[PDB]
Amino acid sequence: QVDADCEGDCYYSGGTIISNLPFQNIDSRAVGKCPRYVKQRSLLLATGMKNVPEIAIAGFIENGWEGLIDGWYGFRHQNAQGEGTAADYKSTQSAIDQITGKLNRLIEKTNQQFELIDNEFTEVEKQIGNVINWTRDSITEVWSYNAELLVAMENQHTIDLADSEMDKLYERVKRQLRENAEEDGTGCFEIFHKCDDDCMASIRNNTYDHSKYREEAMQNRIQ
């Protein structure tokens, strides 16, 4: 049946494809601005980072924190006043911007309009029908290979992108701690100088001064 409430531009024998995605597995013979037909039923695109489940204070190298909700990358600090956590807005925003750039690029479908070339109700001549069937199978074999390759590329690039953003953040906190702190194995920094929650919030942004604590921290390292 036909109703005038909804709007789609892709049609097949059983209804209307209404939503924009790169590919589809409803019908090979579809009319209009349509997603490409692929043989694969499921093709999942990585919209998030690589997930290692959680199993004194941990780090990126060991596991990932399930309690982090303010962002994708966070700063957990153990101090004499207490234990508190936050999130980094710069690295999380950059990761979200690059993933949304990937999504805008892929989600848009074509503007090419395709017609019916085969009558499902009444068969076409058998020679040109076999030519059409062979061409459609070759085209959907090309598009299925392209779909699998594209999904694998963007998943691998998303995982490597998240790892690179973590490496950039870790190098940034290393560049702030010139000779005041040193690297404790699991992705953490062991702070030698006594500095409060104001110090932790100062190392959260890029305002940490190394010269104010350099003498006592260096005396702590040499001893």
């Epitope: 998030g48 303010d70 807005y89 999380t92 979200i96 949304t100």
Partner: antibody, heavy 128, light 105 residues
Framework: QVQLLESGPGLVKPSQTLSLTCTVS??????????WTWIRQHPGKGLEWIAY???????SYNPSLRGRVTISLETSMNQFSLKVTSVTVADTALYFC???????????????????????WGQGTMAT | DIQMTQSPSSLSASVGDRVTITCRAS??????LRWYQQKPGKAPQCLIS???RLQSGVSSRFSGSGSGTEFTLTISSLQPEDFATYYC?????????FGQGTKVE
């Protein structure tokens, strides 16, 4: 379709406490990744930021008057309330509540629903 | 208390004229400015967030730029429904401060 409807008395005795509750009618207030803010404006003046609270517990009240205003997040009745004590004539203004997102997601990669990335403001409740 | 100073306070322009508006911050604020438009007697709504972006649904005629202490918003074409008041918010530090006020007519 999250609506940040506000409730209040509307008539405040001088040198007394005032309770302003902005009820969240939507998915949840415990989602995280949002600044739950109170914004006020006297007519003929500008907007003045009051306080912001998160579900994680971070709370920076306006440097203008930290002692007078207290903001608290209440998950059970899905609302966050602003309490200002010793209310004077200058404290009387039109009040707004807003859900300011942490990040900018047009497609829901962090929030998840593609409508949570928007900035939703309350209708407003004038208090005297 | 980064001082947000806007100038000039009152603007008058005809329909279809470009409105160049300035938001001034004292500190070296980095990439953190939300632009708010309110109609009189009406809840404010954000236009430019991050100083180079547009809430999905906001019309593309609104365009913001600027970095550092200097911040600019440009309007390509004025509308009869654009009679409103434009504000800029800073969110870099733990403190949030508004400007004094800029009105178009």
């Amino acid at each position: 379709q999250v609506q940040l409807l506000e409730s209040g008395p509307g008539l405040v005795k001088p040198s007394q406490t005032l309770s302003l509750t902005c009820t969240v009618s939507g998915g949840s207030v415990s989602r995280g990744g949002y600044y739950w803010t109170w914004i006020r404006q006297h007519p003929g003046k500008g907007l003045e930021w009051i306080a912001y609270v998160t579900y994680s517990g971070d709370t920076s009240y306006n440097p203008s008057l930290r002692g007078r205003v207290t903001i608290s997040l209440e998950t059970s009745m899905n609302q966050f309330s602003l309490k200002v004590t010793s209310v004077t004539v200058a404290d009387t203004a039109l009040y707004f509540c807003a859900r300011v997102p942490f990040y900018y997601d047009t497609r829901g990669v962090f929030y998840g629903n593609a409508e949570g990335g928007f900035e939703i403001w309350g209708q407003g409740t004038m208090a005297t | 208390d980064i001082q947000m100073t806007q100038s000039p306070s009152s603007l008058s322009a005809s329909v279809g004229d470009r409105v160049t508006i300035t938001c001034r911050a004292s500190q070296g604020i980095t990439n953190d400015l939300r632009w708010y438009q309110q109609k009189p007697g009406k809840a404010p709504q954000c236009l430019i967030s991050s100083a180079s972006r547009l809430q999905s649904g906001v019309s593309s005629r609104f365009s913001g730029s600027g970095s550092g202490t200097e911040f600019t918003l440009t309007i390509s074409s004025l509308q009869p429904e654009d009679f409103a008041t434009y504000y800029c918010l800073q969110h870099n530090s733990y403190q949030w401060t508004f400007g004094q006020g800029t009105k178009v007519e």
